[PDB]
């Protein structure tokens, strides 16, 4: 699709069998989701946003659908204001910015 930006670029993702809404965010290196259960072991990451730093749990090699486009990659989980899909997964689904 071509998504314009008059509204928040909110899409439906699927992860661990469940549908969620997330924000397509080209200003984010990483993908960070609100608290949820994921399988396997996790590593620590500190990520910085506009308001400061938060600790998150890093899960790797997690399958995730993003408006129906299949990706498998690194998902961070922690206290974010919303689910944000970052460049690590945007690149996997062939996203570019165009003007």
Ligand X SMILES: COC(=O)N[C@H](C(=O)NN(CCC[C@@]1(O)Cc2ccc(cc2)C/C=C\CNC(=O)[C@H](C(C)C)NC1=O)Cc1ccc([C@H]2C=S=CC2)cc1)C(C)(C)C
Q: How far is the CB of 28 from its own copies (least distance, A)?
A: 6
Asked whether the beta carbons of 27 and 49 are under 8 A apart, the reply is no
Asked whether the beta carbons of 13 and 20 are under 8 A apart, the reply is yes
Asked whether the beta carbons of 62 and 38 are under 8 A apart, the reply is yes
| Residues facing residue 14 across a β-bridge | 19, 65
Is there a catalytic annotation at residue 60? no
Name residues contacting Cl ion, limited to 16-75 (CB under 5 A).
Answer: 73-74
- Which stretches of the chain bind its own copies, using CB under 8 A? 1-6, 8-9, 23-29, 32, 47-54, 67, 69, 80-81, 84, 87, 90-91, 93-99
Token duo for residue 26: 């080209």
Choosing from 78, 88, 93, 95, the residue that interacts with Cl ion (CB under 5 A) is 88
| Residues facing residue 66 across a β-bridge | 13, 69
The reply on whether position 24 binds ligand X by CB under 6 A is: no
Catalytic residues: 25
Binding residues for ligand X, per CB under 6 A? 23, 25, 27-30, 32, 47-50, 81-82, 84, 86
């Amino acid at each position: 699709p071509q998504i314009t930006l008059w509204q928040r670029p909110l899409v439906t993702i699927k992860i661990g069998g469940q549908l969620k809404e997330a924000l397509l965010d080209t200003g984010a290196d990483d993908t960070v989701l609100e608290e949820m259960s994921l399988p396997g072991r996790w590593k620590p990451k500190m990520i910085g946003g506009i308001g400061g730093f938060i600790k998150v749990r890093q899960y790797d090699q997690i399958p995730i659908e993003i408006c129906g486009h299949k990706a498998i990659g690194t998902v961070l989980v922690g206290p974010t204001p919303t689910n944000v899909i970052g460049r690590n997964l945007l690149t996997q689904i062939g996203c570019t910015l165009n003007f």
